[PDB]
Design a binder for this molecule. Sequence first.
Ligand SMILES: O=C(/C=N/C(=O)c1ccccc1)NO
Lengths: 237, 300
Amino acid sequence: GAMNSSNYAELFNNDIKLFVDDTNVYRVTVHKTFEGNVATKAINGCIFTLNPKTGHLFLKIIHTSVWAGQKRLSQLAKWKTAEEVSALVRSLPKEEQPKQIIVTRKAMLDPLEVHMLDFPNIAIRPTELRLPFSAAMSIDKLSDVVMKATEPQMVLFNIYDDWLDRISSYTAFSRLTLLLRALKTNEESAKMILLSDPTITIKSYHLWPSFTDEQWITIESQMRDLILTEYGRKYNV
Amino acid sequence: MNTVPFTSAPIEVTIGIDQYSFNVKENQPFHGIKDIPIGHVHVIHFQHADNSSMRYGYWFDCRMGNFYIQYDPKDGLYKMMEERDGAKFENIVHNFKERQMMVSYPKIDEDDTWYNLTEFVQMDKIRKIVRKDENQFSYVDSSMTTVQENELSDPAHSLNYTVINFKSREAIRPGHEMEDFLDKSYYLNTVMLQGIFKNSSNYFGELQFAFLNAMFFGNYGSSLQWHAMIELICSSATVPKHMLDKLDEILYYQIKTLPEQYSDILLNERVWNICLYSSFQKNSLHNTEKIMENKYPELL
Ligand SMILES: O=C(/C=N/C(=O)c1ccccc1)NO
């Protein structure tokens, strides 16, 4: 069934699963035309496919060219996502294919389900969680490779950097969703928080800064503050 | 005009013949039904006065033999049987007609309802859906499940309707996933019409049979099948024009005939609103949409 707070530890067990988020697959800027009408120009997108246990991010870049000459792009995008996820599963050895794929938006269920009819044993599941994966394009190095791509391309990132060396998956995921929730609620503040101290660098092979355990608690506390705050500022409390 | 004689009516029962029905009291001197129109399939059905649970009945065609009804006090139901001795059958019927112990199938002459509800229904096809090859007539009741219901437990007593499943490899061509899911014309025209049903008449006959089993027995898996077969057409962008016109007529009379009080359980709000207002064929069911909106606007 659907994935919610009650069955949250199932993510870190030893059944392979992937979250698929499609919120950044079809991205546009909206602008005025010379005739004073409105028009969209698509920009590069990405599928966020994530193993929550390992941190493996299979980042499929959706080059604007895939949209050329197509109608009903918001609908196509769901199918395109499903086709790309399906191709991914088929490319992985059997022992690495997911037992479950969990979609962050219910509109992806049917597209994925139809694309995966060949895999009756892979459960396609929604979730009730309001997960912040849309904020993945506020991670500078992910946005960079999406915006630079000149063709379709798959890029691999470990979204937890080296954290699993020191913490559990349950804690790595909880940090990731706190970071991304913060970035989604106020990107400037969130980023300021992460970078204020120039002595803490992001290794070339990482996405996030090399905080010590203690620095991560401070950071994590500051992100919680930010999220409470922005919530007040939003609801005046 | 043909006759279904009853040996007797030992238990109080409501007897349906096609869309008609009448009350028989316990040990009332009833000996059957006469003047049944030749040329159509028919259904005779039963709901006991005591146990309104289990509507049941028999699909038959009087051209395929001489049939009578006899109560079975061990199995507790009105059973249909064939009389092979044709002289014995004529003699029995004539005696009962002379003594006027029979109800007259009460067709009004202007009335084409039954024809319009059974236009494509053919006994031979019924017998493939209800497998009991030693009899020329077919038994259906409220509780029989369909082949596809069993796939989601007694196979001999099932309704072997054609399985329709919109999220199946049969329905979806590899590489046309989105195309085939959003426009089911491939599945209608190639898989089902050309491949399985052969023509639109056999397709329409299953659909009318499913509808009739749903209405007369409240057979749930029958209603599911009727709705699926409507949806598959309504969700195909490419449908022969003659099929849409006949579909509109078929459904029109189904909807006309449905009891007003049973609409809440026999009609699937989602399928109907989709078919009438969202689907490719939303503008192609003019008679069906007009009766639906004047008779069941609540559903819409
Ligand atoms: O070599 C490794 C790490 N492998 C990854 O981090 C990885 C990332 C994204 C996709 C696939 C693999 N094992 O410790």
